Symmetry: D3
Subunit: 170 residues, 6 copies
């Protein structure tokens, strides 16, 4: 089974979710999942020499307004491998509806005091937004980053996404 | 299920195939699949300080004249992880013979760096030489010897892929 | 199926076992398997700047005193990826109790790296290397308030007996 | 001695120049040389998660129209270490003007990597790779508020002429 | 000339100092400088599988109580290469014993750290990890080190100025 | 000053020598020193996908064959950076010819990595590792049409004898 379907959204939803990582921090290769099997698949090589600034993936058993799993960005000191599960605490949301959750690992004590969007250095939020603003520029795509929402908003959206998945897939 | 059996050979065969990568470029560890489970498995550590010059794996649902999956070499700038699927355009074929053990050479469809690589003449000669030399010498300390009987072009590679897709059906179908 | 349950303990047990690697040498991230799915999972980031000194994982279809799969440490020159199977020759065993639980761990070498062809017993390992591995286990959870006791190292015969015992514990637990 | 002053511009200028590399391909840290000593120095950490797409450095004993050493970008498969000299064949030139000054940069390949033996002019480079390099320079300082315009790429002949100009400009300035 | 002797202590001491890095974050090899030449030298391979948690080096033209240059620890996201100079803002000081204290600093030119100005800006677990590294990394060599705690940015800056003065006394 | 000329051969020659490392284990880029400045320089990219199996460099103030520095190979677990000095204990010597000239190379271990404390002679090295090093030298220039011949390995006593000869020749010939 594709792990997107097999894994639960999290152990204490929405305060703690599972993040199924597709793309380790530092990658220029953009990975996704094969729909039928759930094997890792190369979506594309980014057209610019940019790298993912976060460990990037999806929350299992979620679906969202834009017709795809709900994306999640986990701040990790040492990247994980693709297809690794991280227990993640949502701390905010990037408003790109194609919004993406920002989260920290529960089990890295470095981040113990990161509980809301105000705990993240502004330069780091700017770097993440800039990456999503420009990484597909050479593919003729544009995106506006509207801004960042707080942890409460992120959690509300996670609950919506958990419900949408149950509705679409049963 | 073992992904070698579960995945299709490609989305537009033989122009575009799936390469199931087993070994990232730069690895001295030689990985294969466990037959029953499809888990990555260490076949061996190469006996010499050589590394794979390409991302290396197999085309799903293929079987080749030599009684193994058909091997494919994908030229990647940044290596992928083992068990990653790459949509790949065949551009040629290495005529390795230990005895028909030929291997497809391909480029990723979705790396625009390679957009104009469509045939064997598009590859730098020194790079074809480096790949051939690797396969010529990497098992020398294991007492194996192999001959590289040249490179074939994209048309030849594509024909061989279709033959291997049919071989698999004959064997497992 | 979780590969811990699906994969046999090894091709020629206990002389050659399968090591199902969870943590590559050089990682500070400590990985484990999700019970239901067998996906790789982050257990924790180590609280100190230590890295795993060996490729670390479990022997499939084993269980041990501490209520977990039997752990195995494979000495690899180039680390493997998580969820890679290595055919491993046991050469010794680290006798360690964690919070009062027997939590011994097999030490092994890859059968198919000729560098290790003459490593067959615990006496073939450099003393400083055994010391470094023991020290890692002695101190890696110190900042989590744990204290671990390292008893010493057993030989290849002792390791192999424990592997067979653990294969049997698994059958009792899950059979 | 600062190697930027001590080394010659090249062994056969402008056909073959020395590239003194400051920044390996793959770095997000932007390095420069300390003026007095010639040690490597961190200029900045790029404000965006971008990495240098080329091995990046300077041609010794050059000075360019923007009042700096003339920059050179060497296409390398495996990155070198900072302060490594590469014998480099110029193949083209990136026409950049940033913050309002003419800050063009040579594009070159290593003479001694046979992979690049048939790269001799700008037409030999994949278009997407030229695009990626230009986009990096167009956007890597966006979060610092810096204006940039990439006018396009010149050919090997143009690059070589500019190198000779820069060699002479250094003489004209430093003696 | 050995860069320890050749470089100045910093461009705006003690607010901004130069850190001459010897050991990148992530190294298990412990490097130092050859005294005569200033070439990087392997001091030892750490006896345990620990890696440096910070980019580690010295402040040029300093000397300290224990008869050595004043050590500095710089928090980088991406490690630098040995013999790289970093312009560094001191934010605190690890107290370790003769006094063998070590400055904790952040790079001026990484905006990630713009709001790191004092020891209270550092995650507690990160301070704990650095202290634990120094407490235990020589344990297999028979050494013990008590970590006495962490001082603040003001304390760190005073010690930097004291060390610049001690160098002048030692070397002229 | 070029460190090859400035540094001494070692602190207790020939029992402990200095190895000035040019090429870290794992490199496919072959580095050398610029004669005039002593800066690291790319000699070539190896024509085959092979990497140096050891940390490779030279013993300072030695004169071998045609007046070249004596080469030394240091076995390191974690590679060092180019231009790093390692205190090294010679344990053997690789006897080989390159383009028809004797071009023997010392094999050594780091004094200050306790992993290697009991490595003191050529018999202490796994046979497969000696074979891997020899094979690298046998084949790494094959695509350059270069002819190398590998003769075998000498022991620590022989290695030390050859180091001292090269130290003495430098005393006679340099300058
Ligand atoms: N094979």
């Amino acid at each position: 089974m594709n792990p997107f379907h097999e894994l639960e959204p999290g152990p204490e939803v929405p305060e703690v979710v599972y993040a199924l990582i597709e793309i380790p921090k530092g990658s220029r290769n953009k990975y996704e999942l094969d729909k039928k099997t759930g094997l890792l698949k190369l979506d594309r090589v980014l057209y610019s020499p940019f790298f993912y600034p976060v460990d990037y993936g999806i929350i299992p058993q979620t679906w969202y307004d834009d017709g795809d799993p709900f994306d999640i960005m986990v701040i990790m000191r040492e990247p994980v491998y693709p297809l690794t599960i991280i227990e993640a605490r949502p701390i905010g949301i990037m408003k790109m509806k194609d919004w993406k959750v920002l989260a920290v690992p529960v089990e890295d004590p470095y981040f113990n005091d990161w509980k809301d969007i105000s705990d993240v250095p502004k330069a780091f939020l700017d770097e993440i937004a800039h990456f999503f603003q420009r990484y597909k520029e050479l593919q003729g795509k544009t995106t506006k980053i509207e801004g960042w929402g707080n942890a409460e908003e992120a959690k509300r959206e996670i609950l919506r996404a958990i419900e949408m998945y149950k509705e679409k897939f049963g």
